[PDB]
From a paper:
pmcMHC class I molecules bind peptide antigens and present them to cytotoxic T lymphocytes (CTLs). We herein demonstrate that human leukocyte antigen (HLA)-A∗24:02 and HLA-C∗14:02 proteins, which are known to bind conventional long peptides, also have the potential to bind N-myristoylated short lipopeptides. These HLA class I molecules shared a serine at position 9 (Ser9) with Mamu-B∗098, in contrast to most MHC class I molecules that harbor a larger amino acid residue, such as tyrosine, at this position.
We also elucidated the crystal structure of HLA-C∗14:02 complexed with the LYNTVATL (LL8) peptide to address whether B-pocket remodeling may occur in order to capture the P2 amino acid residue, Tyr. Alternatively, the side chain of Ser9 formed a hydrogen bond with the phenolic hydroxyl group of the P2 Tyr residue, allowing its anchoring at the B pocket. Thus, the hinged switch-like movement of the hydroxymethyl group of Ser9 appeared to control peptide and lipopeptide binding.
Author numbering:
A (entry chain C): 1 to 8
B (entry chain B): 0 to 99
C (entry chain A): 1 to 276
Write the structure that this text describes.
C-alpha cells in the first residue's frame, strides 16, 4: 500500500 | 550530479546445459543517473524482445536493472551483454562466461 | 519473523524534452509486488506478484491515484530544488525517495524509515524516532522548516506505524506460501587452472531466498580473505538469488580449502570442498 506525501 | 558507471554481470537463470531452455541475464547495478540502454547479443547481433525489470535502487541510491531473455544454449552460440550509459564513451560489451 | 514493506520512487527531469518521468516499485522483503511508470503506454499501478492480483479493481484504482499524485508532487519538488540550489533550467536532475516499515524478529512493528536523495546525494531523512528530520545541507533545511511547521513527520509516522504495518501483514498472509518460506541455496564448487602453479576455486550458491547470504573460504579451517573475490548477489529472475565467491589457490593445494555458506534456509552453516 503506497503513501503519497508533501512536496520538498 | 553523481555519475557512477554500471557493474555488469552476464549469466543464466539456471546452470547452462546445451539443448535445455533457460534464461540469459544481464544484471546492471551501481549506476547513476538512471538512464541506461542494455542489449543482449547472440553471435554479435541484437536479440529482439528482451525484457527487463522495473527500475529500483540500493541503499546507496545507485540503480539496478535485470535484462533477460529465454534461450536454449548450444555448444557454439556466443552471447554477450552490451551496455550504454552516460559514463561510457562507447557501449561496453561483456561476454557470457558459463561459470561466472 | 522479521519482514519489511519497502517502496522506491524515482523522478527524473529532462528539460526541453517534456516533463519529468516518475517510476515507483514496492517490495515485501526481497519480492517485488507493484510498479508504476509515468512514461508507460498507459500509466497505472500494476501487480508484479501473484498475491496482490486478487485485491480487486478498487484497490488498484486507489494505488494508481496515489502514484499519479506522487508523480505530480515530485514535479513540484524538482522545481523547488532547482531554485534552492540556484541551478540552471537546462540540466537534468533526479529525486529518489525510499520508505518502509519493518517487523522485528517477533513479528511486531520495530521501526520505519523515510529518506530522500537529490542527484544521488542525501537530501533529507526522517530520523529513527519518526518525529524529526536530518537535513544534509542548507537547501534541505528549507524543506525541514516547512515540514516542521506542517507537522509532516506525524503524518509520515501515522502511515509507517499503522497502515504500512497492517498492509504488510495482509500481504504476508496472502503470499505466505512464498513470502514466509526460506529457500536454501543449492551449492557446488568449480575449479579452473590458471597457470602451472595457480588455480581458481569458485564456490556457488544458487536458487536461494531471501537474498542475504554469506560465502567464505577457509584454508585449514582459517578464514581466507586476502585472495578471495566476491560478486554482488544477483537476481536469477525467478524470485531467487545467486552469488559466488572465488579464491585463488596454489595448484595441488585445493583440498586444503573449504567454502562455508550461511543462509536463513540452512539449519546450520554448510561446509563444501572441491570434488573433482
Ligand atoms: Na559484482
Amino acid at each position: 500500500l503506497y503513501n503519497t506525501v508533501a512536496t520538498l | 550530479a553523481i555519475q557512477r558507471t554500471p557493474k555488469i554481470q552476464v549469466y543464466s537463470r539456471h546452470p547452462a546445459e546445451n539443448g535445455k531452455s533457460n534464461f540469459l541475464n544481464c544484471y546492471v547495478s551501481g549506476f547513476h543517473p538512471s538512464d541506461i540502454e542494455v542489449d543482449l547479443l547472440k553471435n554479435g547481433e541484437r536479440i529482439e524482445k528482451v525484457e527487463h525489470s522495473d527500475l529500483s535502487f540500493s541503499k546507496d541510491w545507485s540503480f539496478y536493472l535485470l535484462y533477460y531473455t529465454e534461450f536454449t544454449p548450444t555448444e557454439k552460440d556466443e552471447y554477450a551483454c552490451r551496455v550504454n550509459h552516460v559514463t561510457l564513451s562507447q557501449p561496453k560489451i561483456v561476454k557470457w562466461d558459463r561459470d561466472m | 519473523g522479521s519482514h519489511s514493506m519497502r517502496y522506491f520512487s524515482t523522478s527524473v527531469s529532462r528539460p526541453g524534452r517534456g516533463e519529468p518521468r516518475f517510476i515507483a516499485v514496492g517490495y515485501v522483503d526481497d519480492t517485488q509486488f507493484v510498479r508504476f511508470d509515468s512514461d508507460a503506454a498507459s500509466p497505472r499501478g500494476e501487480p508484479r506478484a501473484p498475491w496482490v492480483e486478487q485485491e480487486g479493481p478498487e484497490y488498484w484504482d486507489r494505488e494508481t491515484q496515489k502514484y499519479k499524485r506522487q508523480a505530480q508532487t515530485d514535479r513540484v519538488s524538482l522545481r523547488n530544488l532547482r531554485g534552492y540550489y540556484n541551478q540552471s533550467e537546462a540540466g537534468s536532475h533526479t529525486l529518489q525517495w525510499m520508505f518502509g516499515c519493518d517487523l522485528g524478529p517477533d513479528g511486531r512493528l520495530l521501526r520505519g524509515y523515510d529518506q530522500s536523495a537529490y542527484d544521488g546525494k542525501d537530501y533529507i531523512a526522517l530520523n529513527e524516532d519518526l518525529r524529526s528530520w536530518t537535513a544534509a545541507d542548507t537547501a534541505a533545511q528549507i524543506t525541514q522548516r516547512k515540514w516542521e511547521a506542517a507537522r509532516e513527520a506525524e503524518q509520515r509516522r501515522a502511515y509507517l506505524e499503522g497502515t504500512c504495518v497492517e498492509w504488510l501483514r495482509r500481504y504476508l498472509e496472502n503470499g505466505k506460501e512464498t513470502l514466509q518460506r526460506a529457500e536454501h541455496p543449492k551449492t557446488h564448487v568449480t575449479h579452473h587452472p590458471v597457470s602451472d602453479h595457480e588455480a581458481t576455486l569458485r564456490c556457488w550458491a544458487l536458487g536461494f531466498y531471501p537474498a542475504e547470504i554469506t560465502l567464505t573460504w577457509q584454508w585449514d579451517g582459517e578464514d581466507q580473505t586476502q585472495d578471495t573475490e566476491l560478486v554482488e548477489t544477483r537476481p536469477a529472475g525467478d524470485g531467487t538469488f545467486q552469488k559466488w565467491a572465488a579464491v585463488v589457490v596454489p595448484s595441488g593445494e585445493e583440498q586444503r580449502y573449504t567454502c562455508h555458506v550461511q543462509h536463513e534456509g540452512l539449519p546450520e552453516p554448510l561446509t563444501l570442498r572441491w570434488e573433482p
